[PDB]
């Protein structure tokens, strides 16, 4: 599924992402944007063996299990197949985690490069929230 930029602010909100950990809503749907362009599909399969899953971009060394990637941890303790569902709880919880874990929002590259220090109220300006 591709979602649109309010829908998948409406979805990220009833998740309880909005000032999850100090990140506001637009800072969430900022950062789906450029790693996935909001694609529940996207996938990245990269060099080292591991691969990005899903409409955040999880990678699957720490956090998801592909049973294909050297020193898997699945710390968020589920297949990565189920963070490309059109359904983003999975990839919520597991973003969720990733913050958890004292990572903060700077774990996504796409973030820290196109979000970080930008009017990420644009993301959610108009929406109906």
Same mark, same amino acid.
């Given at each position: 599924k591709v979602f649109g930029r309010c829908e998948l602010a409406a979805a990220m909100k009833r998740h309880g992402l909005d000032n999850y950990r100090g990140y506001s809503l637009g800072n969430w749907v900022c950062a789906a944007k450029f790693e996935?362009?909001?694609?529940?599909?996207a996938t990245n399969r990269n060099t080292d063996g591991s691969t990005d899953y899903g409409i955040l971009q999880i990678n699957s060394r720490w956090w998801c299990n592909d049973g294909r990637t050297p020193g898997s941890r699945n710390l968020c303790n589920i297949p990565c197949s189920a963070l490309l569902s059109s359904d983003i709880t999975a990839s919520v919880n597991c973003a969720k985690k990733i913050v958890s !874990?004292?990572?903060?929002?700077?774990?996504?590259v796409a973030w820290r490069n196109?979000?970080?220090?930008? !009017?990420?109220?644009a993301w959610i300006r108009g929406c109906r929230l």
């Open positions: 996935s362009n909001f694609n529940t599909q !874990d004292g990572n903060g929002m700077n774990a996504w196109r979000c970080k220090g930008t !009017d990420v109220q």
